[PDB]
Design a binder for these strands. Structure first.
Ligand SMILES: [Mg+2]
Ligand SMILES: [Mg+2]
Ligand SMILES: [Mg+2]
Ligand SMILES: [Mg+2]
Ligand SMILES: [Mg+2]
Ligand SMILES: [Mg+2]
Lengths: 638, 673
DNA sequence: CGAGGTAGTAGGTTGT
DNA sequence: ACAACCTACTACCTCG
DNA sequence: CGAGGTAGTAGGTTGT
DNA sequence: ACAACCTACTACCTCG
């Protein structure tokens, strides 16, 4: 729309497949005893590896770039205690057409195993799977950091090796955990063994094993090396040069040749139009300019630092904000403490009885247990809450404004909105999350084309990442109803955003329900990884980049700051619907600017998805049982 | 303090253990390979069985009632085992640990000496000895379930309870070769794994691509499964651990798992019948095993006071409140939704409600929802308006629905804050019990207190906890009766959890909500709360909650309420009646809460007072009386005290419908009954 | 708990 | 088993 | 979906 | 493994 430009992907064209490689050998797999219908795939994958060479599962049997005579055609196989005896039978050679994508897939699996194999046969280089660390970045008392790249290798439809590369660093420890704290570093929150890779959370016995304290090795993180301060984010120009360097080094050293940089047509997307009361360039400006929509609100202060009132500068800033919005503000103070037990809960009930909408909490940094308990208790009285750490100087503007912003989203005000005009006037995001054996499936939405309302819905408990079909529809029905309650009508079109892959048929019911109500839709999968890197052929790297790729599949570079490192574009698939890709790309990129609780940095994900993700993250942390009396317009979880 | 009486338990006293038994033999175990620390206690269990004799696990090794020299001391199962005599260890039955091992021995002795009999069908600690009923292909056997352990006087105790067993003696092919329909469940003829049967398939066994390459027939044949059988026809069965994959199988390799639905034959016994039958079998067992003549054990039982149910006047059952008036009626509005295409309230339902509310001096408005679900969202809008006009609960007249549609409808109405009561619609006025219950359910769902107790209890707040739901995660939930009279029933939003254990913060939070409702209703904190747990109280589950109650100055009692494990109770003389309190140890007692002659032999609840200073008699009194508060069953009282029965029904429905619907539903409205 | 992404360190689910 | 995605955490740097 | 317990059938979690 | 508890289904029979 705003400029047809051109970019380099972090892929590289390498040599064509030789006519052998285009004609892999085929072996059929014979097992004794034959495996149960649930152990097939993990077993074929195993035989494929045991046979050695460059071999991959191809259907119900195997395909290899190695002639069968230099393969381990007979052997045995251990899985979950059971023992299977395999034998491979060569069945001639099937040529594969790289154009046909079915056949291209298997060629690409071969390609991947080749790279992995030829990587082993190198030195003196640290390799783990398809990653290789060919240099040293940093060292110290018992630790070193290696530099290298994670690689991948497949086959293009023109029949050539494509090679994906991305510079990466690796943290390696050189001491026993005793030998580690032979110098002053505390207990790492994770420890690994040198006798197995099986780590955990952290005298008679270990005797007979011939294996407590000198047997393991610490799993080193950045928290363990804060005290030593080098960083491992690369500026995008350095990352691109080191990408090319490494893509050539692998070209020769593995005999694949000259790395031809891969190029793609990108498009510059129109700039989004953020509005407070008037136009702003960042959500924090709404504190000076005024909010997009603002009603009469009452905030209350809760101090845990033993201090007395509203900090004056917070008070003024607040009146300035509400002054510019021409909305009436009243500031309350909770004169109570969580240590009074239920007396506290009474105090909260009365605050809310008197119109308080959210609570600002000044406190020293809290233990998560106390932090969580506090939040959850205020939630049970219908009060969302924003915490602001209490050694606080006015000079720390970015910290308190962001708190202020969060507090207001929590009280239910729309601080900013978009002023364009879009194909969908309801955009809803779905994530799953939660740090247990079950998860919460959940959803948040922007209602109105301007994004003039942000609501969450009560999540639902679920076994895995898949959201049950009726759940997907129900949460979606709640967002339509929110639209109905604000616009007095149904939306003509809904933009449905799912975090990650859309598991097979997950939205079948919902889509069918939309048709019946005559609501158009677009389902888009939004992938946070798998997009790779994008570099400008010439000039500078900027946001709003849209890269069409396959059909119904595109990259989208939504955020970039030339101080955070190389950005990582989202990868998006249009799963259902008939809106032109460019239009989805436009609306999603704009939705990225709608987030109210970050004053100075837009989120990589569009607002509905980012909110959804925070929502399920918080429910999973506090529990769902607290949320009955909390208004959906109040974004409690930001 | 009401008067005592004596009962017979279904236990029996047998002979004292002899000098030899009190001093079992100890053997240490060597295994090659060594056991992987997680897989070692099941292993010692295996060696103990393969050793032979009466031999069990005892901590690190084994204890035997056979001398080592007549045990299979060396063998293959970790695979190779060898056992080493390490002398004999005296055991003191007064020591609960040592008693625990004597008892493990006794069970093994029982199973072993049961094995050596003939001709009697034996499964674990059960024995079937006669033939109740048969049919071409199937037979139901009649025997009893037993257990045997050691008292602390050092003598055997036999427990006996009559039981029937349903057996299929035919393959699924031979079964269907009789005319018998499709058994809803089936089992492999080669292992104990069972499948849900979906249908038959036209397909050919010879040619059916099983994942991997094999077909159906060769796959089973390559395992020797058809060695001695016939493949039969293609069967389609269902995921044990998924929900998007029917699976091919072979009729000739399958056996039906027979249930009542697959067959005129009541298997419940009238209490006097079970009583004698128990005594026969006990005298028979004790004779055959050379354990002496069984003296049935007797226990002191105490009869509790008849609970006084209060409608607006006193009643003997909740349904009478429909004639006499409710405990506490408010101005209420109900709407009608007809899925039968008919219109208006059946006059007899209109009358009954009018009679009930007139007796209660409270006004009633009846609405009709002129909307239907197949309108889609316009139907939600109709609901939203109805809530807006004050409708509190909706009666739904409909043909028997499928669970999917039932569930969706109840959830939708829930999303507009409207509890519903379904009443199936071929409905004659003379079906008084069904529609009166429906009416009782409707009113509860609208938030009325239909009945309440009059009496004096230690706790003026009683809360029940349970976990349920049918997945890899469950809901931990709580329901409660507030006030001495329990004239306020409430639920709380349940919380998802991994298994049976409710997290400590959850327990407290749920408990806090019920304190909060008490505060809202009574203007103060409660003086004492009665905490009822369904099943056992997992170690420390209430630690945090109890600590919190203490800090707030609220007294408490924790009681574990166990639906099984309490055995049977019979009168020494006279008819058997409920309201029986039978203390066993300090802090543990039996409680017969409900019984009806026509409803077979009652199973009393087993209770354990886990914390609190309240006397057992008192707890028993309140718990027994709490059993009578339940408003949605007009003609028979639930076995559980109302707070737990409510909690159980709560978490069932939340599991069934999902918690996402509950946000706008008032906690006074008992939507799940 | 200020927030954002990019970096690193773990790990888990979907599904062929 | 393994590809191709997701979850959680801390440190770094700067403030569309 | 009428409700209750006791029957039968299947399965599971908690703790040693 | 095993002991001692829990969940779900449906048949039966009657209506504190
Ligand atoms: Mg996700
Ligand atoms: Mg997430
Ligand atoms: Mg926040
Ligand atoms: Mg339970
Ligand atoms: Mg239950
Ligand atoms: Mg009901």
């Amino acid at each position: 729309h705003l400029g047809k430009t051109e970019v380099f992907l972090n892929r590289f064209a390498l040599r064509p497949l030789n006519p052998e490689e285009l004609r892999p050998w085929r072996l059929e797999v014979v097992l004794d005893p034959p495996p149960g219908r649930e152990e097939v795939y993990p077993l074929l994958a195993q035989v494929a590896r045991r046979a050695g060479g460059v071999t991959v599962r191809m259907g119900d049997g195997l395909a290899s770039w190695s002639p069968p005579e230099v393969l381990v055609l007979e052997g045995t196989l251990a899985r979950m205690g059971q023992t299977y005896a395999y034998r491979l039978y060569p069945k001639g050679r099937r040529p594969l057409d790289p154009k046909d994508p079915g056949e291209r897939s298997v060629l690409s699996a071969l390609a991947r195993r080749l790279l992995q194999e030829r990587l082993r046969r190198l030195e003196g280089v640290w390799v783990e799977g398809l990653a290789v660390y060919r240099r040293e970045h940093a060292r110290g008392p018992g630790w070193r950091v290696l530099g290298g790249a994670v690689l991948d290798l497949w086959v293009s439809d023109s029949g050539a090796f494509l090679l994906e590369v991305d510079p990466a660093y690796r943290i390696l420890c050189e001491m026993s955990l005793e030998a580690w704290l032979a110098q002053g570093h505390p207990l790492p929150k994770r420890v690994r063994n040198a006798y197995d890779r099986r780590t955990w959370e952290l005298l008679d016995y270990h005797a007979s094993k011939g294996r407590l304290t000198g047997l393991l090795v610490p799993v080193l993180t950045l928290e363990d090396l804060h005290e030593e301060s080098l960083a491992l984010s690369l500026p995008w120009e350095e990352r691109r040069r080191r990408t090319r360097e490494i893509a050539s080094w692998i070209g020769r050293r593995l005999g694949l040749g000259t790395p031809e940089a891969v190029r793609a047509q990108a498009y510059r997307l129109s700039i989004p139009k953020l509005m407070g009361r008037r136009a702003v360039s960042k959500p924090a400006d709404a504190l000076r300019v005024g909010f997009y929509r603002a009603q009469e609100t009452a905030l209350a202060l809760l101090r845990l630092d033993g201090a007395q009132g509203w900090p004056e500068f917070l008070r003024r800033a607040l009146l300035r904000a509400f002054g510019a919005s021409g909305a009436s503000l009243r500031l309350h103070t909770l004169h109570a403490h969580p240590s009074q037990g239920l007396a506290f809960r009474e105090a909260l009930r009365k605050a809310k009885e008197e119109g308080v909408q959210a609570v600002l909490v000044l406190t020293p940094p809290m233990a998560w247990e106390d932090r969580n308990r506090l939040k959850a208790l205020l939630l049970r009285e219908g009060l969302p809450s924003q915490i602001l750490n209490v050694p606080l100087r006015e000079e720390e503007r970015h910290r308190w404004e962001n708190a202020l912003l969060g507090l207001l989203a929590k009280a239910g005000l729309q601080v900013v909105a978009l002023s364009g005009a879009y194909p969908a006037e309801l955009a809803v995001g779905f994530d799953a999350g939660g740090r247990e054996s079950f998860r919460f499936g959940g959803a948040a939405c922007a209602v109105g084309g301007d994004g003039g309302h942000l609501l969450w819905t009560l999540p639902e408990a679920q076994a895995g990442e898949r959201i049950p079909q009726e759940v997907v529809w129900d949460l979606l029905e709640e967002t339509l109803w929110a639209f109905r309650r604000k616009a007095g009508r149904l939306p003509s079109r809904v933009l449905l955003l799912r975090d990650g892959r859309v598991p097979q048929d997950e939205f079948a019911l919902a889509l069918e329900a939309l048709a019946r109500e005559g609501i158009a839709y677009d389902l888009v999968s939004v992938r946070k990884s798998g997009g790779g890197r994008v570099y400008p052929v010439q000039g500078r790297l900027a946001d709003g980049l849209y890269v069409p790729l396959e059909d119904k599949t595109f990259l989208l570079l939504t955020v970039h700051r030339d101080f955070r490192g190389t950005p990582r574009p989202l990868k998006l698939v249009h799963e259902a619907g008939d809106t032109p890709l460019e239009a989805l790309a436009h609306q999603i990129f704009h939705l990225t600017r709608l987030y109210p609780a970050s004053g100075f940095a837009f989120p990589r994900l569009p607002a509905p998805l980012h909110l959804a993700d925070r929502l399920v993250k918080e429910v999973g942390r506090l529990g769902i049982r607290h949320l009955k009396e909390v208004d959906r317009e109040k974004l409690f979880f930001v």
